[PDB]
Amino acid sequence: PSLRTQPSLYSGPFPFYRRPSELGCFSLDAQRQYHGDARALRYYSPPPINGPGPDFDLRDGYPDRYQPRDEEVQERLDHLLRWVLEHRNQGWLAGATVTWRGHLTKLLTTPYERQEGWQLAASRFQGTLYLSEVETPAARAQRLARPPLLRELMYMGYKFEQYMCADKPGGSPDPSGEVNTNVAYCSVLRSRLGNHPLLFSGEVDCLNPQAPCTQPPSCYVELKTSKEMHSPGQWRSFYRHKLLKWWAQSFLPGVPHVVAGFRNPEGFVCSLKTFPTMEMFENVRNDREGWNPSVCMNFCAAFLSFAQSTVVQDDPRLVHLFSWEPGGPVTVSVHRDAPYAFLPSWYVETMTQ
Ligand SMILES: Nc1nc2c(ncn2[C@@H]2O[C@H](COP(=O)(O)OP(=O)(O)O)[C@@H](O)[C@H]2O)c(=O)[nH]1
Ligand SMILES: [Mg+2]
């Protein structure tokens, strides 16, 4: 059938969500090449009490010292599949759903999302269900038309991370190097939502070498950017929409610590604010127009359930395309081979042996 999306259908007790465990990780380098190590992981290095508070020029180095990752390249699940292949002997996988954390984020935010539609392609292969986002025609059009100032704004986000990160534990941030968005660190995580086992990985911003719990993902820190705010209305508006995204993104991998840099009209970060992941909901708890963690999760569970029961055939060439648009239900279409098939032959053959 189709799956309804509205929040009042998914109120009720917070579902079972197993505390995420890191099964491993991988890194992408300056030219988007996979390495099965943590080389790209950077280390949390906030401004000390000793010296000045933050005064970070997010415009510095734009565009000369900016090497943006090529966005035309469809990567699908490839990097994760490689990790999965290199670790096949860790039958749990057969019952798992496999994705990127980001895809799960969009499921979590669906009941409250007013603008951004999405498309998830789904193939079952050896029991395992694989989900992989397809960029909607609308979203592609917006990406190809990205205005100069929106391109700079993306840079500034990654630039903020450079002021807050050191290459080594207890090191100093070097805000004069290149920002290269091909370079990423990813944690590979195991969880279970309800009775749906999960294998997913997400981009991790940095490690806090001063977190008393030295074990991932507890020791990770997410670094965020947003417009400076003044009126209560701007804060309320931030809590209701943006905070929801931040919560979903870091809750899934079990990242407890989020730091926000608020940027000037002149493009400087003159204040920081820490949002512990577990505290984010307190900002909207009494808000009649707020979001609810268990609405996000109950919908997400219902979607997984829906996808599991819909995708019956075990076939790597077969795709059930799940589509969603704000103010509508999740609908399904069936497709075979190109252009929607996403599991590469090199993976299918090798997992078959
Ligand atoms: N090309 C491309 N890669 C992405 C994008 N978003 C995430 N990735 C990559 O996909 C992997 C998982 O990302 P994920 O955690 O799901 O993204 P996020 O939660 O939206 O920040 C990482 O290796 C990222 O570098 C994107 O919009 N374009
Ligand atoms: Mg971030």
From Swiss-Prot:
Effect of residue 205 to A: Abolishes the decapping activity on both incomplete m7G cap and NAD-cap RNAs
Domain of life: Eukaryota
Binding residue positions for Mg(2+) 2: 161, 203, 205
Entry binding sites for substrate: 32, 75, 100-102, 186, 203, 224, 249
Cofactor: Mg(2+)
Positions that bind Mg(2+) 1: 161, 205, 222-223
Record keywords: Exonuclease, Hydrolase, Magnesium, Metal-binding, Nuclease, Nucleotide-binding, Nucleus, Phosphoprotein, RNA-binding
Region described as Adenosine 3',5'-bisphosphate: spans on this chain: 222-225
Cystine pairs: none
EC number from the UniProt entry: 3.6.1.-, 3.1.13.-
Function: Decapping enzyme for NAD-capped RNAs: specifically hydrolyzes the nicotinamide adenine dinucleotide (NAD) cap from a subset of RNAs by removing the entire NAD moiety from the 5'-end of an NAD-capped RNA. The NAD-cap is present at the 5'-end of some RNAs and snoRNAs. In contrast to the canonical 5'-end N7 methylguanosine (m7G) cap, the NAD cap promotes mRNA decay. Preferentially acts on NAD-capped transcripts in response to environmental stress.
Protein name: Decapping and exoribonuclease protein
